[PDB]
Every structure is written in structure tokens, then in C-alpha cells.
Design an enzyme around this catalytic site. Structure first.
Site, short mmCIF file in Angstrom:
data_model
loop_
_atom_site.label_atom_id
_atom_site.label_comp_id
_atom_site.label_asym_id
_atom_site.label_seq_id
_atom_site.Cartn_x
_atom_site.Cartn_y
_atom_site.Cartn_z
N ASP A 85 0.82 -1.21 0.00
CA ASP A 85 0.00 0.00 0.00
C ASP A 85 0.86 1.26 0.00
OD1 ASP A 85 -2.14 1.80 0.15
OD2 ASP A 85 -2.60 1.36 2.24
N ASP A 134 -1.51 5.12 -5.75
CA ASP A 134 -1.94 4.25 -4.66
C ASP A 134 -2.15 2.80 -5.13
OD1 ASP A 134 -2.94 3.16 -2.31
OD2 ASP A 134 -4.70 4.46 -2.21
O1 LIG Z 1 -8.53 2.68 1.74
C1 LIG Z 1 -7.93 1.97 0.95
N1 LIG Z 1 -7.76 2.28 -0.34
C2 LIG Z 1 -8.34 3.47 -0.94
C3 LIG Z 1 -9.75 3.23 -1.45
S1 LIG Z 1 -9.67 2.50 -3.11
C4 LIG Z 1 -7.31 0.68 1.41
C5 LIG Z 1 -8.18 -0.51 1.00
N2 LIG Z 1 -7.43 -1.70 1.41
C6 LIG Z 1 -8.02 -2.92 0.88
C7 LIG Z 1 -7.65 -3.12 -0.58
C8 LIG Z 1 -6.36 -2.86 -1.03
C9 LIG Z 1 -6.03 -3.04 -2.37
C10 LIG Z 1 -7.00 -3.50 -3.26
F1 LIG Z 1 -6.69 -3.68 -4.56
C11 LIG Z 1 -8.30 -3.77 -2.82
C12 LIG Z 1 -8.62 -3.58 -1.47
C13 LIG Z 1 -7.36 -1.79 2.87
C14 LIG Z 1 -6.51 -0.59 3.29
N3 LIG Z 1 -7.09 0.67 2.85
#
Ligand SMILES: O=C(NCCS)[C@@H]1CN(Cc2ccc(F)cc2)CCN1
EC number: 3.4.23.46
Length: 370
Positions: free
Chosen positions: A36, A219
Site C-alpha cells: 500500500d 496508490d
Molecule cells: O482505503 C484503501 N484504499 C483506498 C480506497 S480504493 C485501502 C483498502 N485496502 C483494501 C484493498 C487494497 C487493495 C485493493 F486492490 C483492494 C482492497 C485496505 C486498506 N485501505
């Protein structure tokens, strides 16, 4: 490149997140960790949970040190609460090193862990400013750089249907064409500046400040390309007009509904390309990155797809939609982010993803929000 032992170290199912193998404590307890770049905390599941097959056991680690402080971290998607501490962390398919890093032990969570995702923790690769509780809690990569000879750089190649996280350098077999760099505006998120947006070669004709209203970030911990209210509306109307050869329900353009075709019959040709122009390193210069429908339409569990462009109230989020088309270089040492055409990106025999430049652009500094 000499990073052949690092290639193919990423895994993860569609829309659930890309993860890397990591170990925590002594003896090493193996966990899969979500990559992340939109957060700055290193946190692992440290108590049983319905979606966790394994978790971090602090009592079994001799090198665990209790910081005796509780931590709460909310994200845009998901939240968790836990207890702070330090321990020895390693990346089996990364650099051959071991570091003492801050680890938040997740004892409580909500909408965070995903069923069948196969990951048990989160690697916050962004800078200290946006770390909870404050910027005194040193992120993992800052610890890694300060303690070892591993350079202040990492690169991501997210492959839609695996991929590679190259820590310390750049593997040239993971991309095609030239690498184009955009300046990091501020060291908190991986903030970049978008100067121009094109849908199938047509300019959206908006003030470039709208493209970055609040912020524009890179991101890996986000599935979708998220766009500010105004930009999202302008984009959807433009994508809708360009793909008017087929009619779709209104819920599809909102992620509420899916669209399906027969296996192998999917007509990608009807959907337009999306080009994001990014500020160049040279004054009055820019370069564009172009994505295909293969990137912004993601396979769902006949072939069914979900529209992976959504609206945002916290600015532009360049998610996996963007990153699955490109080999992205997070050059922290030189405060810049590189984009090259990914060698693993999904394309067809008619079209391919592109990174092109340079382009002449006057008044670029304006495009940022104050
Ligand atoms: O807030 C967040 N991203 C921004 C919204 S898109 C992240 C979301 N993550 C889960 C996640 C991570 C990558 C993915 F491909 C799908 C789901 C948990 C940590 N927080």
C-alpha cells in the site's frame, strides 16, 4: 538486472489487493502483506479473525518489544485498531536483510481484511507525515533505508489477469520503451500533478486544478481510478458517448451493475482509451500515460466486468487501474515517480498501453491545489 530473485514476488486476486511475502519476529513467522503506497503504517493481524488463516503471535517472538501504546487507523476503505511495538522484519523474496521496524498489532478491524484475499497485514510505503498517530512513528521503508545499504527507491509492476516489487533498484525486463518521471509534489502521499486528461484523444477542457482538486496520488492499495466529483462526471459522459455503440444500464457507470459477454467475444474496441498527462521534470514539459479498457474494466467472479472508475471527495487516486498498465518507479531519493509501459500489462492485437512525450505545456505550477 541483478533482481531476478525479486521478480514474481507479488500475488493477489482481482480487486482484493497485491501482497508480498514477509516474516515478523524470531523465529520468523511468515505472513502475506498488502502493498500500500497510499498509507504509512506497517500493521499485521495479531489476533484471530474470520478472514485470517494465520496471524502474528507476539508471545512466540523473543525479539518483540512492546511500545505500550494503542493505535487506531482509519482508511478510505477499512479501519483497524491495535497495539504498537517493534520487531525484526524480513522480506524472503526481497533484499537479503533484517531490520527492526514499527509493527502495529491489529487486535480489532472493520471492513479491512477481505475474504479469500490471502493477506494478513498491510505495508504502508508512503511517508511519515501521514502515519498514525504522528510522524514520529517511522514507516517500514524509512527503517529499511536507515539500517541497511538498500537504496531509497522501490518499483512496482502490478500484473492483472502477479507481478514484482523490486526493492532497491529497477529491473529493465519488467518494462518496454522509455521511463518518464513526474515530480513528487510533497512527501506525504505519493502526490503527483495531472495537467491534462483525454478520453479517446479528446480533451476534457477543464481547469487543470480540478484534476488535482485536493490531491492526485499514486496508490497500489486502491482498486479504482478515483476522480474528483467534477472530473468523474465529465469523464463518464465522455466514455459513455465514445462507447455508445452498445447501451449499458446506468448502474454500471457507478460500479453497482456488471456487464457481461460470451467468453473471448469481449469487444474492447468500442471502449475508448484514457490518457493522463503528468507534469514533466523539465519546465514547460509533460508526458502522457494511456490506459486501455483492459485496465479500467476489471474481471468479476461468460466474461463479466466491473467499471473500475469511481468518484472521490478526497482528490484523484491513481489505483491499480492505472498501475496495472505500467511499471511504476517510486524514486524517493530523487523525489520523483517513473512510468513505463509494463511488459505484463493486458492488451490486444489492435491496441497497447502507452507512455509518450515530451509535450509543451504553459503554466504547469497552477494545476496544483492550495
Ligand atoms: O482505503 C484503501 N484504499 C483506498 C480506497 S480504493 C485501502 C483498502 N485496502 C483494501 C484493498 C487494497 C487493495 C485493493 F486492490 C483492494 C482492497 C485496505 C486498506 N485501505
Amino acid at each position: 538486472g541483478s533482481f531476478v530473485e525479486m521478480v514474481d514476488n507479488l500475488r493477489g486476486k482481482s480487486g482484493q489487493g497485491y501482497y508480498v511475502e514477509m516474516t515478523v519476529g524470531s523465529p520468523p513467522q511468515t505472513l502475506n502483506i498488502l502493498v500500500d503506497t497510499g498509507s504509512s503504517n506497517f500493521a499485521v493481524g495479531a489476533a484471530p479473525h474470520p478472514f485470517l488463516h494465520r496471524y502474528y503471535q507476539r508471545q512466540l517472538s523473543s525479539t518483540y518489544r512492546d511500545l505500550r501504546k494503542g493505535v487506531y487507523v482509519p482508511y478510505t476503505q477499512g479501519a483497524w485498531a491495535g497495539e504498537l511495538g517493534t520487531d525484526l522484519v524480513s522480506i524472503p523474496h526481497g533484499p537479503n536483510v533484517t531490520v527492526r521496524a514499527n509493527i502495529a498489532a491489529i487486535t480489532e478491524s472493520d471492513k479491512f481484511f477481505i475474504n479469500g484475499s490471502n493477506w494478513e497485514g498491510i505495508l504502508g510505503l508512503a511517508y511519515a507525515e501521514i502515519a498514525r498517530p504522528d510522524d514520529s512513528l517511522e514507516p517500514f521503508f524509512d527503517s529499511l533505508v536507515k539500517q541497511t545499504h538498500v537504496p531509497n527507491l522501490f518499483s512496482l509492476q502490478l500484473c492483472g489477469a502477479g507481478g514484482s516489487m523490486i526493492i532497491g533498484g529497477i529491473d529493465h525486463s519488467l518494462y518496454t520503451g522509455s521511463l518518464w518521471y513526474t515530480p513528487i509534489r510533497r512527501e506525504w502521499y505519493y502526490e503527483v500533478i495531472i495537467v491534462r486528461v483525454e478520453i479517446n484523444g479528446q480533451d476534457l477542457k477543464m481547469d487543470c486544478k480540478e484534476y488535482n482538486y485536493d490531491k492526485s496520488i499514486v496508490d497500489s492499495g486502491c482498486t479504482n481510478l478515483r476522480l474528483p466529483k467534477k472530473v468523474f462526471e465529465a469523464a463518464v459522459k465522455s466514455i459513455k458517448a465514445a462507447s455508445s455503440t452498445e447501451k449499458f444500464p446506468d448502474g454500471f457507470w457507478l460500479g453497482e451493475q456488471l456487464v457481461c459477454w460470451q467468453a473471448g467475444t469481449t469487444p474492447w474496441n468500442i471502449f475508448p482509451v484514457i490518457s493522463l498527462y503528468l507534469m514533466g521534470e523539465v519546465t514547460n514539459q509533460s508526458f502522457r500515460i494511456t490506459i486501455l479498457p483492459q485496465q479500467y474494466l476489471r474481471p468479476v467472479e461468460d466474461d463479466c466486468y466491473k467499471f473500475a472508475i469511481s468518484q472521490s471527495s478526497t482528490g484523484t487516486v491513481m489505483g491499480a487501474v492505472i498501475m496495472e498498465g505500467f511499471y511504476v518507479v517510486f524514486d524517493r531519493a530523487r523525489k520523483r515517480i517513473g512510468f513505463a509501459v509494463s511488459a505484463c500489462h493486458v492488451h490486444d492485437e489492435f491496441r497497447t498501453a502507452a507512455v509518450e512525450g515530451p509535450f509543451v505545456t504553459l503554466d504547469m505550477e497552477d494545476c496544483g491545489y492550495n
